Amino acid sequence: EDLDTDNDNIPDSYERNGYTIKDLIAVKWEDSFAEQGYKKYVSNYLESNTAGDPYTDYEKASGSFDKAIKTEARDPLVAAYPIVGVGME
Amino acid sequence: IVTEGNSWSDYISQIDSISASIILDTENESYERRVTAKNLQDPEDKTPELTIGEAIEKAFGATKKDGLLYFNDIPIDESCVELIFDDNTANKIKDS
Amino acid sequence: APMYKVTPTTNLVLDGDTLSTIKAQENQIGNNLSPGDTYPKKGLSPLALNTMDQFSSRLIPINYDQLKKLDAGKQIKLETTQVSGNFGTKNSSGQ
Numbered sequence: 001e002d003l004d005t006d007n008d009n010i011p012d013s014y015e016r017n018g019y020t021i022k023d024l025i026a027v028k029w030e031d032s033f034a035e036q037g038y039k040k041y042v043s044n045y046l047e048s049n050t051a052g053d054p055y056t057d058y059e060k061a062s063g064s065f066d067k068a069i070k071t072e073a074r075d076p077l078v079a080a081y082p083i084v085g086v087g088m089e
Numbered sequence: 090i091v092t093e094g095n096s097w098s099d100y101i102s103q104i105d106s107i108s109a110s111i112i113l114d115t116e117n118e119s120y121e122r123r124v125t126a127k128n129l130q131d132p133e134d135k136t137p138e139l140t141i142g143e144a145i146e147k148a149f150g151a152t153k154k155d156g157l158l159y160f161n162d163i164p165i166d167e168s169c170v171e172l173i174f175d176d177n178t179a180n181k182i183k184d185s
Numbered sequence: 186a187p188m189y190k191v192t193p194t195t196n197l198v199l200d201g202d203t204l205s206t207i208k209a210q211e212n213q214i215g216n217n218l219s220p221g222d223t224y225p226k227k228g229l230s231p232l233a234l235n236t237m238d239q240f241s242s243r244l245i246p247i248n249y250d251q252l253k254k255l256d257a258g259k260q261i262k263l264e265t266t267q268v269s270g271n272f273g274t275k276n277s278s279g280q
């Protein structure tokens with residue numbers, strides 16, 4: 001309903017069942033939203049950082065972080081994480 | 090005015106990733122600009138839509154005379170200047 | 186538990202003589218060391234400890250009477266005396 005435990009901007013049942021971010025607020029997911037380009041997100045309702053990266057579930061889902069981060073890291077289950085490496089020539 | 094602890098490196102990547110680069114190369118002078126684009130995949134990207142003509146008008150401060158943009162007195166309309174793109178932009182612009 | 190910014194201190198002993206004790210410099214600091222892991226991780230090569238001053242601009246010297254027995258069939262030993270590292274906590278924001 002409106003109970004929030006991990007203390008982000010997403011309620012418990014929304015994270016448990018499914019939610020999408022529109023107009024900077026979290027709303028329940030309806031299957032008719034898919035054809036507009038929206039995505040279904042599920043997170044952990046007892047943790048503020050489901051993946052463990054610096055950004056919380058709300059920041060990742062709403063795309064409220066560094067705009068250079070790839071759009072496939074906006075779901076809470078995928079971590080924003082670089083794999084920098086070095087090669088010699 | 091404080092200029093210590095304010096780095097451009099924090100905004101270089103965030104700006105290059107949501108913008109298109111336009112370079113106007115006049116005689117004995119060069120200009121480079123970044124104009125914000127819009128992502129049509131994301132439904133929550135409310136950035137205003139622009140065409141290349143409006144982007145060129147905004148970036149370099151050109152003023153229309155009879156529907157054709159002039160920089161100061163130099164014609165910059167597509168029929169009076171030479172446009173050069175890379176392979177990706179050429180492919181993305183030939184189909185549109 | 187993991188240890189961040191591992192900075193061990195080691196001794197080098199030839200026969201009964203401690204040649205030098207060197208603390209890890211910025212070249213030989215491991216940022217991450219999870220339990221059961223190793224630095225460098227398995228599959229990589231060992232890291233070279235070949236400097237003795239604070240800024241890594243001075244090599245480790247040995248005596249002539251030490252090198253003589255070093256090349257005469259005697260080996261050196263390494264003993265770790267202490268290790269200093271860090272641990273992670275959450276601040277007032279959530280980082």
Ligand SMILES: [Ca+2]
Pocket residue numbers: 004005006007008009010011012015045
């Ligand atoms: Ca929550």
Ligand SMILES: [Ca+2]
Pocket residue numbers: 006008015043044045046047048049050057
């Ligand atoms: Ca959560």
